[PDB]
Design a protein around this ligand. Sequence first.
Ligand SMILES: O=c1c(O)c(-c2ccc(O)c(O)c2)oc2cc(O)cc(O)c12
Length: 265
Amino acid sequence: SQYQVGPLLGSGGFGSVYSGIRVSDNLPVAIKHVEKDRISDWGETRVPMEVVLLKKVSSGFSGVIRLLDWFERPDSFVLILERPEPVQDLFDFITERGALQEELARSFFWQVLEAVRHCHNCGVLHRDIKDENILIDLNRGELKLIDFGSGALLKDTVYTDFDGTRVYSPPEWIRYHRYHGRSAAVWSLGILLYDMVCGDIPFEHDEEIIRGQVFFRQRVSSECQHLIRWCLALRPSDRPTFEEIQNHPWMQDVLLPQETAEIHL
Ligand SMILES: O=c1c(O)c(-c2ccc(O)c(O)c2)oc2cc(O)cc(O)c12
């Protein structure tokens, strides 16, 4: 009654997400439904961890989707979220346009880095960083992180649980069912960057992940290749920090989001 429901944006392991409008001020929103029995992790009154995590990051402005409100139903939780318009997720974007120019990929990747740092600084680990979980505000050139349904509170001890996307998961998970948050995040960022500049992910099978050998199907600069291979180092301790990523030569002279939209969008 407080929101006007529109068409279904998408569904999957995360639940069902509808387009909507806040009747109060015609604010475009996204309405996400999550069935309770399909929830594995809870936090605190007890709610999905997703709600806990979103609240920890929804303060201030950032490249993270904002949680505006939420409700509890008998068999589900309903999430009212920010909705950019016009919008397109990075997966569909790369699908339509193919591999992105490095200038565009630099801008996008930088914004993802800023958003991930924001989460970590707020005590939140996303655990499912990938193209499908990134929205593009096509007019402003701003990227937003979505779907914290597989995330966790950030800790410095080892994780033994994972329900993110396998082809983005690090070799230490595939092999030992153990990983640490930051180093595992950096791996997925390596997969993401490759996806941006090559138009597809580098590894499909478990053994390809374990081997960690990167082949470039597209013309990619030596500096970008180096950063990717660095992020995808087999030993977690050999992976760069976020600081080392953003101070990498390939990450210099990033375009502002608005410049990015004007030139590329
Ligand atoms: O605006 C959108 C939105 O906020 C989300 C979203 C947010 C948080 C979640 O936890 C989640 O699973 C999805 O999905 C979308 C999917 C689309 O195709 C288009 C959109 O505009 C949105």
